[PDB]
Nucleic acid binder design. Structure first.
Ligand SMILES: Nc1ncnc2c1ncn2[C@@H]1O[C@H](COP(=O)(O)OP(=O)(O)OP(=O)(O)O)[C@@H](O)[C@H]1O
Ligand SMILES: *[C@H]1c2c(cc3ccc4cccc5ccc2c3c45)[C@@H](O)[C@H](O)[C@@H]1O
Ligand SMILES: [Ca+2]
Ligand SMILES: [Ca+2]
Length: 341
DNA sequence: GGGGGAAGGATTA
DNA sequence: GAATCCTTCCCCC
């Protein structure tokens, strides 16, 4: 299997740079202004000019303005990015039927039946970068290797506007030398447990009692890392099927008053139902973000599809169960639908 | 024992 | 911006 992964560079920010060329060169920051006060909210992403100074995805807008008070701050325009993303994804389908769209700006192509070696794969990578640059003027980074994980790692090492191949030999080298925290799917919580077990490389997972690893990070995570360590990871590139769809809305002020929360809840339902677009869910979950930012959720699965009216009455029951079983004030209230027919 | 499915919390980019 | 993962609990052959 030969996998080719594409990751659009600082995507949201780059799309804004494309719709407004004067932004190129300056530091650009795309935000999600929450609506609580003056500049409440967080940074969704920033271009490299801004990242040079520590302004990156995740930090509060307030902090970003203390680092770069003069950068360009743009409100996120998700619909526009999604549209551009759809177009670029269509460019990608002309290079392979087997394609896995992982997120708004990441996709995996199984090009095993299109190239004979990594040299041909690397050239197809350039072709793709050129085509996207030609049609949409967006630079992306290509990663290529024997499987999805290494193709992704390959792109992480080469971004921005890069391209890299990780042949079978370098895979073996990385299995011994790559910091295990840089492996896709290993986030902080998992990385800290591996450090506290003396595991810093994938290879280290081969010399520990399985049950001890499975006990600290879970069976799936353990089998996953072990299979990568043994150079036996080969998950196929499959089509992604959206499994849940929802919306959560931040309330004007945190509350525990059902009648005060209702309007927001119902808004989340209306939005979600639109997003569903012809999809009929059998399951619904009301999701609450408490004042201390913890997440409490209550759901229900029906034996038939949920109609909007049913979603209305059921979400209220579910909201009370949350209010009943938890005493904290609610900050954000939302809904999530799943188990489509 | 384990296939099968529902539910809630954990974890991730 | 949200979505999937993972672990536990339980019906039933
Ligand atoms: N708050 C966050 N913390 C950590 N990672 C985040 C956060 N927000 C977004 N990301 C990740 O960053 C990616 C978007 O980054 P972007 O395309 O804008 O520039 P990029 O850094 O080149 O992409 P990548 O993050 O894949 O390197 C998302 O796919 C994910
Ligand atoms: C948006 C938000 C937040 C946390 C996460 C955590 C992990 C994610 C993995 C993949 C996609 C994704 C999209 C939005 C996310 C994610 C992820 C919150 O910190 C934030 O409040 C928003 O909900
Ligand atoms: Ca990206
Ligand atoms: Ca990590």
């Amino acid at each position: 299997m030969i996998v080719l992964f594409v990751d659009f560079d600082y995507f949201y920010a780059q799309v804004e740079e494309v719709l407004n060329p004067s932004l190129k060169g300056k530091p650009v920051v795309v935000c999600v202004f929450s609506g609580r006060f003056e500049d409440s909210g967080a940074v969704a992403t920033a271009n490299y000019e801004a990242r040079k100074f520590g302004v990156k995805a995740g930090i509060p807008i307030v902090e970003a303005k203390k680092i770069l008070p003069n950068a360009v701050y743009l409100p996120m325009r998700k619909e526009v990015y999604q549209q551009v993303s759809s177009r670029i994804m269509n460019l990608l389908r002309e290079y392979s039927e087997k394609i896995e769209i992982a997120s708004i700006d990441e996709a995996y192509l199984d090009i095993s039946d299109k190239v004979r070696d990594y040299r041909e794969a690397y050239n197809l990578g350039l072709e793709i970068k050129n085509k996207i640059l030609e049609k949409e003027k967006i630079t992306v980074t290509v990663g290529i290797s024997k499987n999805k994980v290494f193709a992704k790692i390959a792109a992480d090492m080469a971004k921005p506007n890069g391209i890299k191949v990780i042949d079978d030999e370098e895979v073996k080298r990385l299995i011994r030398e790559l910091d295990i925290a840089d492996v896709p799917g290993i986030g902080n919580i998992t990385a800290e447990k591996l450090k506290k077990l003396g595991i810093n490389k994938l290879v280290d997972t081969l010399s520990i009692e399985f049950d001890k690893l499975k006990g600290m990070i879970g069976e799936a995570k353990a089998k996953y890392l072990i299979s990568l360590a043994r150079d036996e990871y080969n998950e196929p590139i499959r089509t992604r099927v959206r499994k849940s769809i929802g919306r959560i809305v931040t309330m004007k002020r945190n509350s525990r008053n059902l009648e005060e929360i209702k309007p927001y809840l119902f808004r989340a339902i209306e939005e979600s139902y639109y997003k569903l677009d012809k999809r009929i869910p059998k399951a619904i979950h009301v999701v609450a973000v408490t004042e201390d930012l913890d997440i409490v959720s209550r759901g229900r699965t029906f034996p038939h599809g949920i109609s909007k009216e049913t979603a209305y009455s059921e979400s209220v029951k579910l909201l009370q169960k949350i209010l009943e079983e938890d005493e904290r004030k609610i900050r954000r209230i939302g809904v999530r639908f799943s188990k489509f027919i």
